[PDB]
A and B are shown apart, each in its own frame.
Chain A
Amino acid sequence: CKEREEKIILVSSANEIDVRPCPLNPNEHKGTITWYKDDSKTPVSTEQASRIHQHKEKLWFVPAKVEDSGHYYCVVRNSSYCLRIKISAKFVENEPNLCYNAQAIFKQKLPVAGDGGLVCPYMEFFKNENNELPKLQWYKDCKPLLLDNIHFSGVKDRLIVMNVAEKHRGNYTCHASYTYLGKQYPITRVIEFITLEENKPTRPVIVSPANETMEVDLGSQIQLICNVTGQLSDIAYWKWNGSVIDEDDPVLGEDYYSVENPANKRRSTLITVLNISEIESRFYKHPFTCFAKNTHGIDAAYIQLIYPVT
C-alpha cells in the first residue's frame, strides 16, 4: 500500500479538544480517507460520540488524554491507489506551576508585518463554529490580556501588540472554548514572542520536504519537489551523501524554478525538483536533503527513501 511517515511530532496540550487532518498532497488528495491507532486494526470509530472518533476526514480527540500519545495512520484508498501515513502525536499536561508545558510551545519561522502579529496557529478546523472563528481570549506569561486596543488588540485569530515602551518578551497563550454536544472544552496555543525584527533576520523556510520517509521500489523512478518560501534571491538546492547533485550526474537531475509573489516580494516560493530516472539500492542508505541559503541563515529539511517492507 506504500507507507509514508511524518518524522516530526506535533506536541499539544492534553485534556483539550484536538484535531489531526491528513497531511496530504496534490495528486493524492482523492476519495476516501481512513484513520487508525498504532498498527493496523479496526479504524477509529466514526461513531460521533466516543472520545476518539473520525469526522469530516479528520481525527478528533475530544477530551484528548495523555494516554493517547503515539502513532496514528491515515489511508487514502481511491480505487487504483492507496496511501498509508504515520504521523506521531504527543499530548502533554502542564509543568508544575505553569499554565503550559514547554514541549507544546510554538515559534514562528517567518514573521508578519507589525510590532505584533501573533497568530493562534492550528485553529482552522475550529473555525467550524458556524463559519466564524470563536472569540479568542489572550494571555502573556499566564496573566490575562485586556484587548482594549491601546496596549493589545484582538482580531480574528491574530493578536496585535502595540508599540509601548515595554518589553514584549513572553510566552503568549491563545484560548478558545469549542462547544461540542452541549458541553465545551478548551483549545490553547502558546507562541513565544521575541525581538528579532525590523531589518531582515528572515532566513528562507523550506515548506515542502518535511523530515519524512517515503517507501519506493528499486525499479521505479520518482521526482522530489523542494518548496521554499523566501525572497527571489534565496537559493534552493538538493544534496545527498553530503554532496550537491552533480551537474552531469546520469540518473539524478536538478531543475530550479521560481514563482514570484505579486502580493509580497519577501514571501515568494522557490521550487527545485530533483528528478530520479531510476531508484538505486545506494539511495536507500542516506536521506535526500533540500537546502536554502540567504546569508541570514540556512534552512534544511529531508525525505528518506526506504526499501518496501517484507
Chain B
Amino acid sequence: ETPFTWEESNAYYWQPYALPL
C-alpha cells in the first residue's frame, strides 16, 4: 500500500467552498 502524503493532498485536492481571511 502507498498511502497519501501531505504534498499529495495539496496537489490533488482543493476547497471550492472555502472563503478568504
Contact = CB atoms under 8 A, between A and B. Distances in A.
B9 A107 contact: no
A153 interface: no
A113 to B, nearest CB: 13
B21 A123 contact: no
Given A21-B6, A124-B6, A124-B9, A88 B21 contact: yes
A132 to B, nearest CB: 10
Contacts of B12: 108-110, 205, 207, 229
Contacts of B10: 23, 210
Interface in B1-21: 1, 3-6, 9-21
B9 A121 contact: yes
Interface residues of A, number: 36
- Dominant secondary structure at the B interface: loop
Contacts of A110: 12
Contacts of A119: 4
B11 to A, nearest CB: 4
A210 B7 CA distance: 12
B14 A90 contact: no
A10 B15 CA distance: 8
A9 B3 contact: no
Nearest to B9: A121
Nearest to A210: B10
B19 A107 contact: no
A90 B18 CA distance: 9
Contacts of A123: 3-4
Interface stretch (A97-105, A159-167, A240-248, A280-288): A97-105
Nearest to B16: A107
A156 B1 contact: yes
Contacts of B17: 102-105
A235 interface: no
A68 to B, nearest CB: 12
A157 interface: yes
A101 B21 CA distance: 15
Contacts of A108: 12-13
A103 B11 CA distance: 18
Contacts of A191: 13
A10 B18 CA distance: 8
Given A121-B4, A124-B4, A103 B9 contact: no
Contact of B15 (A21, A104, A155): A104
B3 to A, nearest CB: 5
A191 B16 CA distance: 11
Given A121-B4, A124-B3, A127-B3, A107 B21 contact: no
Given A104-B15, A104-B18, 5 more contacts: A119-B4, A124-B3, A157-B4, A191-B13, A210-B10
Interface of B: 1, 3-6, 9-21
11 contacts: A9-B18, A11-B15, A71-B21, A90-B21, A103-B17, A105-B17, A106-B15, A127-B3, A133-B3, A156-B1, A207-B11
